[PDB]
């Protein structure tokens, strides 16, 4: 389960919703710990 | 044909950041370790850092430097930090004869041509002695009191030193008569929800200026300008205070 929001870093009118800024929980080097990390994904690679 | 090619080097002020690199071309990366050797002018080569499956550092590094390997492009980095002026030398890249690292110069067989890395700040960046070093004993200067007609604009000047105001953010506090202090401005460009936009602040050099518009009777209070910084205790100072009187 990602939690994505639109990228608004001075975007242009062509690239409006084409980039999503997503954050998710991932396991650390230890299997007993999770941590929040984020990454940028294109709109074509994600669904609601 | 095993060949070593490097990068990095050049002038940086003392305390700066530099990163060196050295890639391996003619042999497998995951079969040999890498090391960094520096030869000061007129001295002999001494071990700096090197990583196979374990990172090792020279006795003089004191935890400043950091070595890593990126198998994707088969390059070994050296994140130099807090570069003191005694680190100037020609830094060589060496490929070990095995997966293991030795502190001696004859545990390696292929060497790089060299790369001069020089630092000649000579304390120019810092220097201390009142400026930056311990901050002496700096006390902010403010006018004794101000007065203006209702609805007019008033200005409050809070001048201090470079460490407390110049090198750190400034926060403003308002103390009404017989009431607890309240925060109005934090880092000179934001306000809380409970404070309107009638108050504005700005900074320039080592002096902070507060602009108040639409002054009213309810605004009669004592204003304090304060700075905070964990790096130095001298920067933690509170202003003398300005008295706001409405005619």
């Amino acid at each position: 389960t990602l939690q994505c929001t639109n990228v608004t870093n001075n975007i242009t009118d062509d690239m409006r919703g084409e980039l999503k800024n997503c954050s998710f929980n991932m396991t650390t080097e230890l299997r007993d710990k999770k941590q929040k990390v984020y990454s940028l994904f294109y709109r074509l690679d994600v669904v609601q | 044909e095993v060949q070593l090619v490097e990068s990095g080097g050049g002038l940086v002020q003392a305390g700066g950041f530099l990163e060196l690199s050295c890639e391996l071309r003619g042999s497998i990366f995951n079969q040999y370790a890498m090391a960094w050797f520096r030869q000061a002018p007129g001295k002999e080569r001494e071990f700096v850092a090197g990583m196979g499956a374990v990172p090792h550092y020279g006795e003089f590094v004191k935890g400043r430097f950091t070595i890593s390997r990126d198998n994707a492009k088969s390059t070994v980095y050296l994140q130099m930090s807090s570069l003191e002026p005694e680190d100037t030398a020609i830094y060589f890249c060496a490929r070990s004869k095995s997966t293991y690292i030795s502190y001696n110069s004859n545990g390696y067989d292929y060497w790089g041509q060299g790369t001069q890395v020089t630092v000649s700040s000579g304390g120019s960046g810092g220097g201390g002695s009142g400026g930056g070093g311990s901050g002496g004993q700096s006390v902010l200067t403010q006018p004794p009191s101000v007065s203006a007609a209702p609805g007019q604009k008033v200005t409050i000047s809070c001048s201090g030193n470079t460490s407390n105001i110049g090198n750190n953010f400034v926060s403003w506090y308002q103390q009404r008569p017989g009431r607890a202090p309240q925060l109005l401005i934090y880092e000179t460009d934001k306000r809380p929800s409970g404070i309107p936009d009638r108050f504005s602040a700005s900074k320039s050099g080592t002096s902070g200026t507060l602009a108040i518009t639409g002054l009213q009777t309810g605004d009669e209070a004592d204003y304090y300008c304060a700075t905070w910084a964990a790096s130095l205790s001298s920067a933690r100072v509170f202003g003398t205070g300005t008295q706001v009187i409405v005619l």
């Binding site: 929980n25 299997r31 710990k33 941590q35 | 607890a180 202090p181 309240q182 934090y186 809380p192």
Partner: protein
């Protein structure tokens, strides 16, 4: 806007010891640091001490080096300030304040073959942020 309560003040002789208690309500005390500010009647403010959220990092002013001790108890939501070697100049008003950074959790405990379970916090980052926005009524301490 949260409620701040200050107590433990009184009239004590010079060279004695006293403890001041500040209570926290309507907010997470463990999630904020604490500071003590001294202000004499008719004079300006003077920062005294500052403590991180976890009580590891301790700061004290030059005038109160080696005589003022500050400690916190997150379980009881009570702040403890121990005073030693009191002097007549210490007669002033003490203010109780909190921090603003709103520390979060860096790590949480995990169950690999579940990973959807809400588990307790493991590690955290915070402290310092010597900025005060809410000031309590304070307590009055007299030395004579």
């Amino acid at each position: 806007q949260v409620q701040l309560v200050e107590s433990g003040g009184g009239v004590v002789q010079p060279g004695t010891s006293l403890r001041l208690s500040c209570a926290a309500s309507q907010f997470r005390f463990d999630g904020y640091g604490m500071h003590w500010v001294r202000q004499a009647p008719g004079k300006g403010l003077e920062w005294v001490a500052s403590i991180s959220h976890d009580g590891i990092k301790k700061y004290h002013a030059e005038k109160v080096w080696g005589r003022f001790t500050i400690s916190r108890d997150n379980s009881k939501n009570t702040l403890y300030l121990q005073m030693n070697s009191l002097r007549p100049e210490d007669t002033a008003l003490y203010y109780c304040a909190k921090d603003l950074r709103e520390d979060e959790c860096e790590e949480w405990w995990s169950d690999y073959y579940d990973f959807g379970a809400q588990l307790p916090c493991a590690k955290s980052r915070g402290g310092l942020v010597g900025i005060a926005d809410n000031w309590g009524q304070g307590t009055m301490v007299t030395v004579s």
